[PDB]
């Protein structure tokens, strides 16, 4: 006939985008040299600073995922005269903020001590810390693109951004000083997990420029040729 | 305790496994969904709706609307040529970038049979056939209407319809072909002929235009997923 | 695949593996020739349910004096055109008692169906693209520079596309091939769409469900939808045949609800 | 042995543990002595089902034409003689209307029947091995050196051992006893053979279904198995008997089977 | 959590373990297979199909096709030794390069019995007598026909049967012998003497041949898998 | 604008040599003669598509067709 | 199998072609033409030829045996 085969497993949605994406490389130090690579550094999350995970939801319109992230934190040694010291392990300080919540506003402040803002402690040398957070939204899905305003006037803002309040991320070392600088970098890695996705949308041509809006330059269509019709016998 | 014995690939973060892992905001009271119309489950019904085929891509046609502006007009001798372009989905560059192939770029593997329609967005006074073709790899390409007769072909008159649809079958040697094509996994080639002519009553404009979209049918499936290259970054987005 | 669950939360489990018119109130559109009426995404526009509704206002629906066809500007078809798009429900922000409504209600939820009618003759060649595309988060001309609220969408006007690029400070890129957008022209054929080729069709009619993620919306903020006009074959005749050929578009709102009545907005 | 399966992928788990003649077409052989017909690893040569052919094209069986008995040309056997071998489908590439369907079609499924026939007489002495060999994947005579397609097999030309080692820059390595495969020559009797003793065999009849990783191939590119005919003990007679013993190969394809018709090949 | 101890041997990779691990690329959806003929499910299938043995290997005739090529004639007086070899399959420089061979090579523990069979490859009127024998260890090698005919043999007609078979029996205190042969597992030794003569009819060539082929019988059986001492390599190939 | 003949095999013998035998000719006649106006397209082609049907052979021999 | 395409001309008198000499070349119709000796075939003729409605003219289509 021929009987027929090949079922559309790896096609699917969640096989498509459950796959463990970069999103962001957050970087800090012991002590601080300048800012950047400064100790207690911060990342209010978004999903659309690399440009990987980003054109793979900006198929769909509305998502529906929950999430599944995990850190590979990763410490060098800062180039100085001397390097000979021995040194307790570090640990490491992962603090999720909700949207609204108090801040650190340096090092060594309370709100690393406080009771409620979730947060996972980490030796270097284990198992990478994975946790998993709902479906944060105030909605019932995902804006990936938002055609409006953010004031009723249409003024202000123009963008998905106004949609886009899943809180912050805040890293530092636990240890109170080392002997010799170490500057440190976690990759926070986001996996989609349990995918509802709604409106399909066309593939993105041309690459993006920022990260808050759809900017972009002209671009032609496709790559181009010699002649349109092929000959040779 | 249980005494327990750790196997080879523990503490080890493996970026595609399955594994569940402990909430950070438990008892959440998640926000009842609703019936947001249109909702996909697959990335093969995105690849099954047509999009129209850039084949006059000779530049600089490309940066303009005439990429998608196939010509045709009347002749002085029949047999010729319209257009023709190789069958590799995801790598020849003029149905890399249609709707099924930014798909197949997100995998590895391809298999099914390819559907191709036609528009002939003409005067509705003028009259003409044409031989679409399809060819087995084989050995070689046909240079002519009398070679590229003996493959697989329909006639498409368009007088009588607008619209044409060619199912491209799948013969080949394996079960998939591969994206990036290599030498091994080749599909063949796609041409079009003129029949007769392109034949018109008085006051009306010669040149006409043919578009060509392309879509999968119910066969069609992809394997083996990876990452796109077409999109580049080195530092990320602010 | 032992299948057991350690962990008391959902998000924390493992991933889951002629003569055929339509009677609109007061008015009446003919024809089409027992053709084609595309709608949306295989949904007809209802109302709203009792699942959704996160309101406690009871709602206004009106349903003759803001659901009947309401018939928009007329633009002028060239060779030299590039395309056309309005931005609804700015389109229909002053027309009759549907853009009275507005003013004085927070929340309102809609369908809508589209009527582009342009009719030519048997010696006139052509072919237009008629689509609606949801959510259209248009980029920018000038880029890192914020852009006017008059630059996407006046009040029913019809915003014009361009051959060449934009090089604006203030407006929307408007590249015709890349749809404002930053994606290709060619594959926009994933929304729902239809096609009005000159030897053929003659009108085109999409009928378009409330495409939204929360269930009612302020419609004086948020753009729903937008009707793209973009011809793919351009026109041509003989120098001798009838040079203007317009495209008319009629647009009626199907099942307009409304909630949160207060003054008049929009401040 | 707890038989427990953690993971929901199969490829993530554990380890499992006379007269008799044969008249195809308008053609007959002659004959075997009721002696032996080696057929295949015991299977014989069947169509393609339906759980195979990936191909949508309907196949091209002419059962006629194509399937009776080739008679290929003569080789000479002496004492200083090494062994031959013919490469199929390339030695049957010009030979009727077989070879006629390889130009026109893209795929190709066929089994064959070889018949090596030689005689002799009571007074000679001798034993030829006669095998076929899939997938013989050949050595070259200068390594680190490409060589030539028409080294390998020309268009039904016996291409030949050697005694010696081959020195040549752009053929293969004809050493008879590493039988051009690097491997001992001693060990090819795992392939379908059958020997012919001169004092009572006279003949060989192999069968040899189509043996390949895919359900059909290109036969333009792709040697299906080769044919090696290898003395082991040489030819030895008195100056007075008949010194002239030649060696005649008779081979035809069983079920024939062609897809993907296209333009005369073979670009 | 639940209260676990380690036991010694964790986070040890064991070359020849049994364990399940994380799949890298999960879902995938394997092409179906096909029914290939000649499927081989055991390594002694190999083993049971005949494969000539290269009994005159006196140099420098292992270059050569001279090499399978044991040669008789007629003689002067009877009662000679044609040709004679240790039976140590693997280890013994006669048989070791046949397909049984190779196949203990990658074992360290044989047995069963083996399979000798001949084929005279000469004239079609020439008549002669053999006596195969086989002789278990004991002491010593037999030096003559009235010594090696106390052990099995057979006798072999080349005027009645051109093939003869002689299976070699299974002698040994032990279950198993060793492949790579001590003093202490020994087999024994296998000789061929002439029974009376090769006589011939005028106008024949003198010196035949004979082929000689090793297999296994149903009770062949090899234990204590390694790696074989016959492949060498120090840097990668390239 | 088309027309479309399917002939059947006519022949007083079953059948016959196809090398030395003209089984039926296929004439297009016109007898209303092409006319139009010097702006209209003036080639108008004539394509012949023909395709055999319930072919059969006997007598298979080496290649004609001396 | 698509043979070849003429001109249709206003001073244009005829065409004809005999079968199956008008097919003895094309694809593997005319490769079983060369081994066999006796043959047997019927056919399929769709003479194609499109105009506009201002073009007039009218052709005769007819397969004549023997």
């Not at chain 2, 594994?19 to 019904?45: C, H, K, W, Y």
């Not at chain 3, 339509?22 to 027992?34: A, P, V, W």
Request: glycine share 6%.
């Amino acid at each position: 006939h021929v009987i027929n085969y090949h079922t559309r497993s790896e096609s699917s949605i969640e096989n498509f985008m459950g796959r463990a994406a970069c999103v962001y490389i957050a970087q800090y130090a012991t002590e601080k040299v300048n800012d950047e690579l400064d100790r207690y550094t911060n990342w209010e999350i978004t999903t659309r600073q690399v440009a990987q995970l980003r054109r793979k939801l900006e198929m769909f319109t509305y998502m529906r995922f929950d999430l599944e992230i995990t850190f590979v934190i990763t410490s060098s040694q800062r180039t100085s005269t001397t390097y000979a010291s021995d040194s307790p392990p570090l640990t490491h300080q992962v603090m999720y903020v909700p949207p609204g919540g108090p801040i650190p506003k340096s090092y060594e402040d309370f709100a690393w001590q406080t009771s409620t803002n979730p947060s996972v402690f980490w030796t270097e040398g284990n198992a990478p810390p994975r946790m998993s957070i709902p479906f944060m939204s105030v909605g019932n899905a995902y804006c990936n693109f938002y055609d409006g305003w953010s004031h009723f006037s249409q003024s202000g803002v123009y963008g998905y951004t106004t949609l886009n309040n899943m809180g912050h991320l805040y890293f530092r070392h636990v240890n109170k000083s080392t002997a010799y600088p170490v500057n440190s970098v976690a990759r926070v890695y986001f996996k989609p997990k349990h995918v509802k996705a709604w409106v399909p949308r066309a593939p993105r041509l041309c690459p993006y420029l920022k990260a808050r809006n759809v900017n972009f330059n002209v671009q032609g269509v496709t790559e181009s040729r010699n002649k349109i019709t092929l000959d040779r016998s | 305790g249980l005494p327990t014995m750790n196997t080879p690939g523990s503490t080890q973060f493996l970026t595609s496994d399955d594994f569940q892992s402990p909430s950070a905001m438990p008892q959440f009271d998640v926000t009842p969904e609703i019936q947001i119309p249109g909702q996909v489950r697959n990335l093969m019904e995105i690849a099954e709706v047509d999009s129209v085929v850039p084949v006059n891509n000779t530049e600089g046609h490309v940066n303009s609307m005439e990429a998608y502006r196939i010509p045709v007009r009347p002749q002085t001798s029949s047999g010729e040529q319209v257009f023709g372009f190789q069958l590799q989905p995801g790598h020849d560059s003029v149905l890399k970038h249609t709707l099924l192939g930014e798909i197949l770029n997100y995998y590895a593997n391809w298999s099914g049979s390819m559907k191709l329609t036609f528009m002939y967005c003409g005067a509705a006074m003028a009259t003409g056939k044409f031989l679409i073709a399809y060819s087995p790899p084989g050995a070689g390409v046909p240079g002519s209407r009398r070679d590229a007769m003996l493959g697989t072909h329909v006639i498409w008159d368009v007088g009588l319809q607008s619209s044409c649809v060619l199912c491209v079958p799948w013969i080949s040697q394996t079960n998939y072909r591969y994206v990036t094509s290599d030498a091994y996994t080749d599909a063949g080639y796609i041409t079009c002929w003129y029949q007769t002519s392109i034949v018109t009553p008085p006051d009306i404009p010669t040149t006409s235009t043919i578009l060509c979209f392309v879509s999968a049918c119910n066969d069609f499936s992809v394997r083996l997923l990876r990452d796109t290259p077409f999109i580049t970054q080195q530092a990320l987005f602010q | 695949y032992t299948n057991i669950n350690y962990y008391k939360d959902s998000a924390s489990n493992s991933l889951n593996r002629r003569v055929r018119s339509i009677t609109l109130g007061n008015s009446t559109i003919t024809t089409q020739e027992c053709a084609n009426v595309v709608v949306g995404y295989g949904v007809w526009p209802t109302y709203l349910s009792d699942h959704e509704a996160t309101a406690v206002d009871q709602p206004t629906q009106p349903d003759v004096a803001t659901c009947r066809f309401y018939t928009l500007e007329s633009v002028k078809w060239e060779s030299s055109s590039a395309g056309w798009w309005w931005k609804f429900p700015e389109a229909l922000s002053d027309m009759g008692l549907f853009g009275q409504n507005m003013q004085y209600h927070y929340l309102g939820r809609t369908g809508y169906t589209i009527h582009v009618q342009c009719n030519a003759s048997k010696f006139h060649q052509g072919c237009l693209l008629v689509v609606c595309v949801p959510e259209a988060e248009m980029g920018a001309a000038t880029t890192d520079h914020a852009f006017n609220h008059t630059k996407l969408s006046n009040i029913g006007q019809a915003m014009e596309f361009s051959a060449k690029k934009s090089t604006d400070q203030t407006g929307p890129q408007t590249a015709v091939h890349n749809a404002g957008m930053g994606v290709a022209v060619g594959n926009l054929t994933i929304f729902p769409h239809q096609w009005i080729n000159l030897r053929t069709n003659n009108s085109a009619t999409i009928v378009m469900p409330y495409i939204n993620s929360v269930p009612m919306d302020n419609m004086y903020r948020h753009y729903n939808f937008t009707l793209m006009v973009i011809p793919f074959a351009k026109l041509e005749h003989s120098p001798q045949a009838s040079t203007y050929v317009p495209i008319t578009v009629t647009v009626a709102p199907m099942c307009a609800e409304y909630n949160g009545l207060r003054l008049a907005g929009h401040q």
